[PDB]
Amino acid sequence: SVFSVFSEEELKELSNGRKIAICGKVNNPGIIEVPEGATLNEIIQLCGGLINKSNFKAAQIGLPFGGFLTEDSLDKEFDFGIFYENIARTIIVLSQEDCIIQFEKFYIEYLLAKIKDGSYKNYEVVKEDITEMFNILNRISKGVSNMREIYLLRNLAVTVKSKMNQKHNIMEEIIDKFYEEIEEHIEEKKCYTSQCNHLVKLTITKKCIGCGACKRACPVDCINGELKKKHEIDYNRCTHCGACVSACPVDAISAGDNTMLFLRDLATPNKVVITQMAPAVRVAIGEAFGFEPGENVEKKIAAGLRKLGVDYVFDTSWGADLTIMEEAAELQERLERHLAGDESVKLPILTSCCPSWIKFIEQNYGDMLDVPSSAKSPMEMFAIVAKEIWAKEKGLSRDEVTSVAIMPCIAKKYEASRAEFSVDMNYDVDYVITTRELIKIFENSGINLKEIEDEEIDTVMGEYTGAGIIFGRTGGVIEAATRTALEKMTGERFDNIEFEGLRGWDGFRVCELEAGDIKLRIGVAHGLREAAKMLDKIRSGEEFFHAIEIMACVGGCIGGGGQPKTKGNKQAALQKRAEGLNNIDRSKTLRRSNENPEVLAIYEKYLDHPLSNKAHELLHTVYFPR
Amino acid sequence: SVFSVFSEEELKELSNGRKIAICGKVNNPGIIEVPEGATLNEIIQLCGGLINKSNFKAAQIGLPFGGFLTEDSLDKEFDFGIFYENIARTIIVLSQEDCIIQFEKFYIEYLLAKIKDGSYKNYEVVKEDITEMFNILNRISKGVSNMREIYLLRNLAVTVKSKMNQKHNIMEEIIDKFYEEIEEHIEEKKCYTSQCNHLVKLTITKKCIGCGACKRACPVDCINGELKKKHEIDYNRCTHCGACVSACPVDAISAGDNTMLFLRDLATPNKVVITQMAPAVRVAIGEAFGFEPGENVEKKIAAGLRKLGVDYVFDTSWGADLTIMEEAAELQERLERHLAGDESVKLPILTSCCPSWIKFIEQNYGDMLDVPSSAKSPMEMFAIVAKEIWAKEKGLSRDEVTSVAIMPCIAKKYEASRAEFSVDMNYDVDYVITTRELIKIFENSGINLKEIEDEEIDTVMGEYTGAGIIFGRTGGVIEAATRTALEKMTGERFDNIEFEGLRGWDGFRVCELEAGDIKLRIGVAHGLREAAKMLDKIRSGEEFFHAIEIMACVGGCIGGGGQPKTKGNKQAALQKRAEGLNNIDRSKTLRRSNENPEVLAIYEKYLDHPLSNKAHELLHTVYFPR
Numbered sequence A, B: 001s002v003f004s005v006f007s008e009e010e011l012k013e014l015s016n017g018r019k020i021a022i023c024g025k026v027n028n029p030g031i032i033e034v035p036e037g038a039t040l041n042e043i044i045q046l047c048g049g050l051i052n053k054s055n056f057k058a059a060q061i062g063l064p065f066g067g068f069l070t071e072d073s074l075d076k077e078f079d080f081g082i083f084y085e086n087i088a089r090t091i092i093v094l095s096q097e098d099c100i101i102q103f104e105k106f107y108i109e110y111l112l113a114k115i116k117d118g119s120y121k122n123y124e125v126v127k128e129d130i131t132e133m134f135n136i137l138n139r140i141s142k143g144v145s146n147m148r149e150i151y152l153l154r155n156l157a158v159t160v161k162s163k164m165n166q167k168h169n170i171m172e173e174i175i176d177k178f179y180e181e182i183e184e185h186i187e188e189k190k191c192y193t194s195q196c197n198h199l200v201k202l203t204i205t206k207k208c209i210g211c212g213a214c215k216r217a218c219p220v221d222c223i224n225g226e227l228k229k230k231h232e233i234d235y236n237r238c239t240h241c242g243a244c245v246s247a248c249p250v251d252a253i254s255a256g257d258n259t260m261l262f263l264r265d266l267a268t269p270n271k272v273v274i275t276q277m278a279p280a281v282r283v284a285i286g287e288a289f290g291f292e293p294g295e296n297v298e299k300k301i302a303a304g305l306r307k308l309g310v311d312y313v314f315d316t317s318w319g320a321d322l323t324i325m326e327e328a329a330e331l332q333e334r335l336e337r338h339l340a341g342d343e344s345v346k347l348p349i350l351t352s353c354c355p356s357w358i359k360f361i362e363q364n365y366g367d368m369l370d371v372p373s374s375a376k377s378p379m380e381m382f383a384i385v386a387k388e389i390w391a392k393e394k395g396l397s398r399d400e401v402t403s404v405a406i407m408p409c410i411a412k413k414y415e416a417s418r419a420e421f422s423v424d425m426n427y428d429v430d431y432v433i434t435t436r437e438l439i440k441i442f443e444n445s446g447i448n449l450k451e452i453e454d455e456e457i458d459t460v461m462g463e464y465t466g467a468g469i470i471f472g473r474t475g476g477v478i479e480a481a482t483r484t485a486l487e488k489m490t491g492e493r494f495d496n497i498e499f500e501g502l503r504g505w506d507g508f509r510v511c512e513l514e515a516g517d518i519k520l521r522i523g524v525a526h527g528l529r530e531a532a533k534m535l536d537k538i539r540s541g542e543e544f545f546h547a548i549e550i551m552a553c554v555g556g557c558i559g560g561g562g563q564p565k566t567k568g569n570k571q572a573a574l575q576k577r578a579e580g581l582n583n584i585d586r587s588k589t590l591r592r593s594n595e596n597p598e599v600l601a602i603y604e605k606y607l608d609h610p611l612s613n614k615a616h617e618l619l620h621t622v623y624f625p626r
């Protein structure tokens, strides 16, 4: 969109007269007259500087590419003549917030959008080559590329430059100048500007005050730094749990921002945008709008999303019910293969819904990848169902539906960016919007959840049970799994559906269940330190468990890194959020995941039953050692 | 090709009269009249049985798919009426040597080849759907698929069945009947019939006599079994070193066979087929044709390949020279970063040319993946150069060149099948032919290397030096690296280019070099047990090394699993092969890899220098933990 700011008529009206058009990261894009004695930095100052005081990165010359200016030309006087022939007297300014891969992808999209009509008709000859460049760059931005694709890009740039008779080629100059950025993108899977939402790493920005709170809160000691000076996160060992983000008092820890992508997706005509809301979002987002912690404002969130333009507002608790339907069956199978089976079974089964815990177990303790449940997280279950069933039966391909996840978690971005959750470069979750980002969007759009009217959530993939809503707090996943599993194992319905002992706030909680003729020993872990301790206990064998639920954040997803900062006592606020989830559970007529009519309909119409072939193919995934 | 055995006229001439056409795995394909009382097994017996006494797997009904028969119908009488309408009275027989994925890929290729002309014109509507099925099946056969692709195939089969008004769909029935085979292909990356050359696992066949030689020779204790009964290889922990294959007296250990693929590729018109020959092949293939071990018959091999139809006969020793040019520069860089540098450097550098050793270090000791050289093996260096430079400059795309590697190694098939060595599903090495397979091809084609005339190897990618030819025997890689590196480090040329101490037959050999003002401590390992021992010593720190060359086979590639079985004393025969390689080295005017004119031309024209950006992108790769 940065390449369509100025029209061709108003660009060509600047053929002579020293007036130039300026866009990009300038505060006030427009057409200004550069004075006689003026440098590039003085031009930027005449434009009002850059968006967020970011340093200058590069500057494209003309809508038809005419080279990049760099920091070496920043202090030098602006030399004319760079607008040699058939190039508009315009500059697109790049700051340290611009990824060169994303910039070139946008440039190729702009070229293709011109070729689709009469403009830039001579570019039809290089259409296939620029399309292949776009595919390679998309693979780079998705982290599914290789080093040899740079050589392929070199060859493509050579081919396009020769047959276009152009003295500057954007691919060739990008390889020459930002090779370090391209190499970082490919080898490190890291986008240092965080524009590639699939390559986002937690980076401490320059506004760090060096208080050490992030270092203290880090469970894996991934953060190095000293008092009163900037800290650094080792993204290689980072689990993306987001504890540092919550602990940071100055919001110096960034993990990307898909707000711009979400706004463009909503404003794009004929683009179907659907959203799924995590359980913990509805009990924390109201604190910014004047609600007490634990108040259920999911109706207000749905109304705000629909006002923003979301076509379908759904709930991740539906996917939570589906995940429980899979996981309880898996637990029953592994329990039957333990009593009447043999040693080939693996116990305890571990919840796989937390992506930070999955990343932790894939990085450290890589030999335990077959212990956690193969079932996908509720977000990914919902996403794959929506892409493969709901959209298919309403006549939309996977590329025609934009599935946005509203999550309280930093690591949900990484989970959505994982390659196995994608088909033909189309990911099941297009991107993740945090609770903080949604709060900012609502505030900037004038939406106030306190006074907005109530709106219903779409029922086809938004209907959920109290077992599915308790996911957002610690112990809820295992409580729902127990609710669904023990009732079918014993044959009778429990009078008290709430299982005490699984609840509480201890770092690790042990519960023993005596229902029926089978005894289940259940563990719950709050943080990644507790997860590591219980993994060590599992390896030692000093204590035994039948099923363990693991969370990366203290208190569950209500304490997630994407949640708004709490007020007063953090423990009290998190407990209030958990109690709000419990009240939502108590207010629901259906409190068992297997009673969910929509999930049952999915099973009877599309799959066959939990742990069937189709159920495995869609709702189950695999892990990879790191 | 199995679907084009009978013409449409001779298939439709069997409309009535009980005569049926039979092809597939039958010994004598043709048209026979089934008697009144006859079962499917009796029909197969009337056809002469199956090719290699393999068990019956399935039977396709009609060239237009009309269902699969299975073992349950094998003992039952052949029921007519299965040729309902618009289907030829023919059966294609599948044995236990037929992969269902390959069979369906061939069926879709046959359908597309019909659609390209007037026949099967009504199938044009499902062309895109069957093409997507073919792409999914190709991804499955290449090991780059997922479980959800089975759900995609289900949807595609539903779509094609409905709009074709067909009562049998091959994709739907394959999912129903061979789901276990499909699941094995996807999850285990294993083709139990070994038809998918990218998913080949070493499998002990039924002709095992249980002598235990494979179990004794296995370095990682991967083989289980008892005396006088069949043994089994745990392909998950298998390193593909091929020691068991060499030790097997009855050839019961199979690792696939690309002979049929090679023959079809050679017989295909307008198909450019090129070959690269490993150094160890030329000193061992003559033993089967009446030459003493160590005799250089590369001229005879080139003549035989050209008679078979190979368009370009090249040498892997050229890629060995290129690999030395990269590796000596890398060793120099890491040595300079050790003396004048700091602890961030990693020593000793380990050779990465052996794929079995690479698989061993990726499976066990997964934290050491950054220790071995990032440089590709000579085979992959040659393959990527041929695909990206030679073919590009002679006007051939990567899909128009069939690059065949003639190797003495089982693990070379796995290396060629690795996904990182491919672009857009086109692998740099299309497939690997072993020395035994080439011997069988020559014998079956009437080619006798003893009396065939001499022919020159193509010089553009076949010219090589004595440093490149010694690769095939133990210590040769490190000897060539030393030859290229020490001369540039010291500035003067050595009078004696052969480095003693690196040669010999000890399991682990330690050599200390005092040339110049720098001292290099070099280790060489024969087998994977020695490699594991030296890894343990490296971790302990009891001894230090500067560079270590690792081989998986005793004696180097001359003792590779794909080599013909030796006669007399195995040690004496392997030493004779090594001495033959040494004599070839001594007979060459150029004995340093950096003197190779073709490699130098590649560096000055296409790359820039060793360890440049383009050199890294093309000739360097990465490893993945398992």
Ligand code: 402
Binding pocket: A277, A278, A279, A280, A281, A316, A317, A319, A320, A353, A354, A355, A377, A378, A379, A380, A407, A408, A409, A412, A471, A472, A473, A477, A557, A558, A560
């Ligand atoms: N996927 C998923 Fe979860 C669900 O349902 C929601 O989205 Fe959590 C919340 N709230 C988050 O973030 S993830 C871990 N399991 C417990 S809750």
Ligand code: 402
Binding pocket: B277, B278, B279, B280, B281, B316, B317, B319, B320, B353, B354, B355, B377, B378, B379, B380, B407, B408, B409, B412, B471, B472, B473, B477, B557, B558, B560
């Ligand atoms: N790649 C490669 Fe090798 C080379 O050159 C050849 O092909 Fe070997 C042989 N002979 C094999 O097999 S691999 C290991 N390094 C030594 S030699």
Ligand code: SF4
Binding pocket: A202, A217, A218, A219, A220, A221, A222, A223, A233, A237, A238, A239, A240, A241, A242, A243, A244, A245
């Ligand atoms: S995210 Fe969790 S792991 Fe990564 S730095 Fe912040 S605290 Fe440490």
Ligand code: SF4
Binding pocket: A204, A207, A208, A209, A210, A211, A212, A213, A214, A215, A230, A231, A244, A247, A248, A249, A250, A251, A252, A253
């Ligand atoms: S918490 Fe925020 S401010 Fe305090 S040190 Fe860590 S990053 Fe810098």
Ligand code: SF4
Binding pocket: A240, A241, A353, A354, A355, A356, A357, A408, A409, A410, A411, A412, A551, A552, A553, A556, A557, A558, A559, A560, A561
């Ligand atoms: S606990 Fe919930 S919030 Fe914290 S990381 Fe795991 S999933 Fe995201």
Ligand code: SF4
Binding pocket: B202, B217, B218, B219, B220, B221, B222, B223, B233, B237, B238, B239, B240, B241, B242, B243, B244, B245
């Ligand atoms: S190949 Fe090497 S590793 Fe695999 S079984 Fe034969 S001997 Fe053991």
Ligand code: SF4
Binding pocket: B204, B207, B208, B209, B210, B211, B212, B213, B214, B215, B230, B231, B244, B247, B248, B249, B250, B251, B252, B253
């Ligand atoms: S060597 Fe061949 S025959 Fe002897 S046991 Fe191993 S596999 Fe069976």
Ligand code: SF4
Binding pocket: B240, B241, B353, B354, B355, B356, B357, B408, B409, B410, B411, B412, B551, B552, B553, B556, B557, B558, B559, B560, B561
């Ligand atoms: S040594 Fe040569 S033959 Fe034996 S495995 Fe390694 S590469 Fe293949």
Ligand SMILES: [Zn+2]
Binding pocket: A099, A100, A101, A102, A141, A185, A190, A191, A192, A193, A194, A195, A196, A199
């Ligand atoms: Zn990026």
Ligand SMILES: [Zn+2]
Binding pocket: B099, B100, B101, B102, B141, B185, B190, B191, B192, B193, B194, B195, B196, B199
């Ligand atoms: Zn197969």
